[PDB]
């Protein structure tokens, strides 16, 4: 029906900095656009309604603007505090959300191999674990390869939450076998391509 | 001030229904529209509907038409809102949110009730090891667990610098999986002791697992 578009994503910033997020609406239905923030562990919490008026006991730092079809929020002087996620509304319709990252310089991923143990073997199932440690920005892929071939949808992924003291990422890619099909194969390893990388990188191990 | 405390967390097998329950307080109950959003784990806000609590109206997204119901209790200034027949999808904290005049925008909002849909029961995890080999990583795999949360420590906390314990992933099977990792040098692999501690209070769950090279 009416679909709001935030852009961009993502922001990555340094605390001090201007933030200036964007939600674009296909139809303009209306003049009237609020914004909400919501921090980890927390319920949303609305700042900005129709388009510039800031809420009861919001910072000033926060202002919002436009009309029609465009809308836009400012943070002037980003904060430690202020790094969260924040949404547009409008009626019954919600923006994607943009979430506000601390900016650093690009850190390449240390990556890790770690075979099944030998007591969850015992069990009847094999986790491989691809450990990608300390790395920035967030985008990163990782390729599991079994015998040289490349598998899909059998691995899931986690990712932190960025490091209050170094604003980098650390995530886990596990791969997860039966027994049997965990031993009819002999090579397994895991594909990292990350930004900070010149080339891929390959952790792999012989069962 | 004006509060709005809903009912305490919920969980529900699939096909159920839950009756949430949002009370409030300092203000005239049934003088300002009562909206209800929910957030499906680690994804965006979603719009359910609303109830005028002045005469009971009510007004449906399209897709839970049918499926819920919006009411309220002016005589205890309590709104409710139930849904029936829950799927996976319906996993989420679900917040009341209150219109400051009569805009459409949610002013006040109350603290969220989650609500687990799950087929599962209790269960307490296997913990494995993930052995290591200036700088070596090595960990401890918490697998198949359920409700969430687990916690994990090493060296019964005395471990803390470059701990990273990912969050949890729910798995096809209903059961939870996570690591916890950490980054030690390699000249200690050899004579340090490094044991994860893990922690899952449903199932009185308290593993202490050794992970050697």
């Known amino acids: 029906e009416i679909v709001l578009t935030q852009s961009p994503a993502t922001l990555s910033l340094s605390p001090g900095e201007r933030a200036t997020l964007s939600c674009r609406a296909s139809?303009?239905?209306?003049?009237?656009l609020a914004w909400y923030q919501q921090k980890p562990g927390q319920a949303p919490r609305l700042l900005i309604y129709?388009?510039?008026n800031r809420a009861t006991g919001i910072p000033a730092r926060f202002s919002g603007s436009g009309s029609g079809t465009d809308f836009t929020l400012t943070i002037s002087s980003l904060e430690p505090e202020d790094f969260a996620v924040y949404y547009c509304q409008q009626y019954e319709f919600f923006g994607q959300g943009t979430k506000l990252e601390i900016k650093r310089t690009v850190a390449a991923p240390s990556v890790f191999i770690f075979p099944p143990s030998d007591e969850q073997l015992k069990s009847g199932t094999a986790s491989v674990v691809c450990l990608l440690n300390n790395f920035y920005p967030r985008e990163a892929k990782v390729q599991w390869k079994v015998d040289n071939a490349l598998q899909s949808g059998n691995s899931q992924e986690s990712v932190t939450e960025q490091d209050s003291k170094d604003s980098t990422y650390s995530l886990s890619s596990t791969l997860t076998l039966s027994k049997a099909d965990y031993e009819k194969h002999k090579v397994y390893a895991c594909e990292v391509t990350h930004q900070g990388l010149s080339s891929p990188v390959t952790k792999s191990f012989n069962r | 001030m004006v509060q709005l405390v809903q009912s305490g967390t919920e969980v529900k097998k699939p096909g159920a229904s839950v009756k949430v329950s949002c009370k409030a307080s300092g203000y005239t109950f049934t003088g300002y529209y009562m909206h209800w959003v929910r957030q499906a784990p680690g994804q965006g806000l979603e719009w359910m509907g609303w109830i005028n609590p002045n005469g009971g109206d009510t007004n449906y997204a399209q897709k839970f038409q049918g499926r819920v119901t919006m009411t309220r209790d002016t005589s205890i200034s309590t709104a409710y809102m139930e849904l029936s027949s829950l799927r996976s999808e319906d996993m989420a904290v679900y917040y009341c949110?209150?219109?400051?005049?009569?805009?459409?925008?949610?002013?006040?909002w109350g603290q969220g009730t989650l609500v687990t849909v799950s087929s599962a029961s209790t269960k307490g995890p296997s913990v494995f090891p993930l052995a290591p080999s200036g700088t070596a990583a090595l960990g401890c795999l918490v697998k198949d667990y359920f409700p969430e949360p687990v916690t994990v420590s090493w060296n019964s906390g005395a471990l803390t610098s470059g701990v990273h314990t990912f969050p949890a992933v729910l798995q096809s099977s209903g059961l939870y999986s996570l690591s916890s990792v950490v980054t030690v040098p390699s000249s200690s692999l050899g004579t340090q002791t490094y044991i994860c501690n893990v922690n899952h209070k449903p199932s009185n769950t308290k593993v202490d697992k050794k992970v050697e090279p």
């Open positions: 949110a209150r219109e400051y005049s009569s805009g459409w925008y949610f002013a006040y």
């Open positions: 129709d388009a510039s």
């Open positions: 139809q303009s239905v209306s003049s009237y």
